[PDB]
């Protein structure tokens, strides 16, 4: 083949297995939890409506993601 013909497939695998992990972080299951598993705050109805099966309030999720951002 050629440079561009394999470069296409390298970029394509890159993009696909980059979409898939960002899409797997998305919650698709259903189990309402009503109580943030770190702080016990009641996860409001709407923030449970967007992502069904979310088991953290928005505050604790922001905290945990801020912690993730440095690889701790």
Partner 1 sequence: YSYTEKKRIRKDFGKRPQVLDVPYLLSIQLDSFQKFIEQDPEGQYGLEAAFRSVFPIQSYSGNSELQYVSYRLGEPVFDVQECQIRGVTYSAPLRVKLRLVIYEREAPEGTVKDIKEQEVYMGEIPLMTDNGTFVINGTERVIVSQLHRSPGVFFDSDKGKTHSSGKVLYNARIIPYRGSWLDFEFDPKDNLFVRIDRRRKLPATIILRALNYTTEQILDLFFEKVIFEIRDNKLQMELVPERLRGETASFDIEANGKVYVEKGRRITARHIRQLEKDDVKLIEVPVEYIAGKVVAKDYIDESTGELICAANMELSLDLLAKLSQSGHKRIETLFTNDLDHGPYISETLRVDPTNDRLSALVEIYRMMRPGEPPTREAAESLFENLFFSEDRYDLSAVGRMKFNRSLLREEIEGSGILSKDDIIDVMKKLIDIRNGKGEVDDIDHLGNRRIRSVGEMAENQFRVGLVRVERAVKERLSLGDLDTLMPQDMINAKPISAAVKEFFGSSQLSQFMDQNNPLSEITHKRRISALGPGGLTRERAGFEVRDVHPTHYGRVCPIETPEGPNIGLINSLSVYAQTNEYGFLETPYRKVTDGVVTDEIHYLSAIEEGNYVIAQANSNLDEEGHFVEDLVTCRSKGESSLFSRDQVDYMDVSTQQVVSVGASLIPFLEHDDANRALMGANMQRQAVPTLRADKPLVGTGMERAVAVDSGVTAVAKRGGVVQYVDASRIVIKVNEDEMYPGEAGIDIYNLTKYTRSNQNTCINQMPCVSLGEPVERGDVLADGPSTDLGELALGQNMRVAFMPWNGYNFEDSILVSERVVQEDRFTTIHIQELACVSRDTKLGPEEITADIPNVGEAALSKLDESGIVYIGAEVTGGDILVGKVTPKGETQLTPEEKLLRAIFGEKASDVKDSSLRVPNGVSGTVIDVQVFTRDGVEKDKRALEIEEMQLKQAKKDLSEELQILEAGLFSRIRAVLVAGGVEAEKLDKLPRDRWLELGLTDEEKQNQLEQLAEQYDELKHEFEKKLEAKRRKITQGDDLAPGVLKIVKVYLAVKRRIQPGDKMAGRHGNKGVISKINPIEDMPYDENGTPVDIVLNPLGVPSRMNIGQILETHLGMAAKGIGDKINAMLKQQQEVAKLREFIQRAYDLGADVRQKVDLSTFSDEEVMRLAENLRKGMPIATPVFDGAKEAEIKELLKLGDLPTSGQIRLYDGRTGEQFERPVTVGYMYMLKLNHLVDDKMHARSTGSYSLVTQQPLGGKAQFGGQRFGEMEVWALEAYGAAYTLQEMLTVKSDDVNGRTKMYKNIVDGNHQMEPGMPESFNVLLKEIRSLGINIELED
Residue span binding partner 1 (CB under 8 A) among the ranges 16-24, 27-35, 43-51, 55-63: 55-63
* CA nearest neighbour of 61 among 43, 46, 49: 43
Shortest CB 49 distance to partner 1, Å:
20
Pick what 34 binds: Zn ion, partner 1, none; C-beta below 5 to 8 Å, kind-dependent: none
Q: How far is the CB of 24 from partner 1 (least distance, A)?
A: 19
| Gap between the Cα atoms of 30 and 53, Å rounded | 5
Are the beta carbons of 35 and 42 closer than 8 angstroms?
yes
């Amino acid at each position: 083949s050629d440079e561009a013909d394999e470069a296409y497939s390298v970029t394509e695998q890159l993009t696909m297995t980059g979409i898939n992990r960002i899409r797997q972080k998305i919650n698709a299951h259903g189990i309402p939890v009503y109580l943030c598993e770190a702080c016990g705050n009641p996860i409001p109805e709407a923030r449970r409506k967007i992502f069904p099966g979310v088991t953290l309030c928005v505050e604790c999720q922001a905290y945990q993601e801020r912690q993730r951002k440095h690889y701790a």
